[PDB]
Amino acid sequence: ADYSRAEALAAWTRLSDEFIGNCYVSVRPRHAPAWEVVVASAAGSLRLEAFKRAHDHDFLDRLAVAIGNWEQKAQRPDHEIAQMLDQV
Amino acid sequence: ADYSRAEALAAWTRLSDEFIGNCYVSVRPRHAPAWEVVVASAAGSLRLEAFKRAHDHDFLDRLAVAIGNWEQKAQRPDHEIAQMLDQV
Incomplete structure (x- = not known):
């Protein structure tokens, strides 16, 4: 199980x-658990x-874009967002 | 372009x-205008x-899913969300 x-x-x-x-919540497809399920399952x-x-549900690409969009609104440097997107 | x-x-x-x-903000791909650009350009x-x-930028499906997900948290009836997803 490689979660790099x-x-x-x-x-x-x-x-x-x-x-x-x-x-x-925004990006979740129907086959993925709701946020409250995630929170309940979370240890650590x-x-x-x-x-x-x-x-696991093949939407980390979309979730990474969303995270990067909110980081852009908080003035995260563009090249740091692009570095994250390249990796993730 | 059909905007129905x-x-x-x-x-x-x-x-x-x-x-x-x-x-x-979450679902916007990089080639779509930022929300503030949309706000400034809306005449209606x-x-x-x-x-x-x-x-136009091929993300209405994802935006519809996001809106449906937040409506589902507001207890919008499940068949209404599915009607919207079916149509949009």
Whole structure:
């Protein structure tokens, strides 16, 4: 079970759990568990659990874009967003 | 360009402009205008402008899923969300 990309996004982001959860709610496809399910299942890092579930359900690409969009609104440097997107 | 799906979504959602904008921020691909550009360009309905731009840039499907997900949290009936998804 290789969660390298999920772990990388978990480390890279500077967003709050509130904002990460809001992104998850928006981008979640129906075959992925709802946010409340994720939160309940989470032992330890919540953003790691969310990003693992996005990886498992093939939407981490979209979740990474959402996270990068909210980081852009908080003036995260463009090249740092592009570095994250390349990796994740 | 056929904007019927954009109009359908604009005539369906019960979310506020601010909530729609937050979904848009998450789902927007890089080649779509930022939310503030949309806001500045809308001559009529802001939500319709946003949905037309999503149609143009091939993300209206994702925006519709995001809005449906937030409506589902507001206890919008499940068949209504599915009607919107079927149409849009």
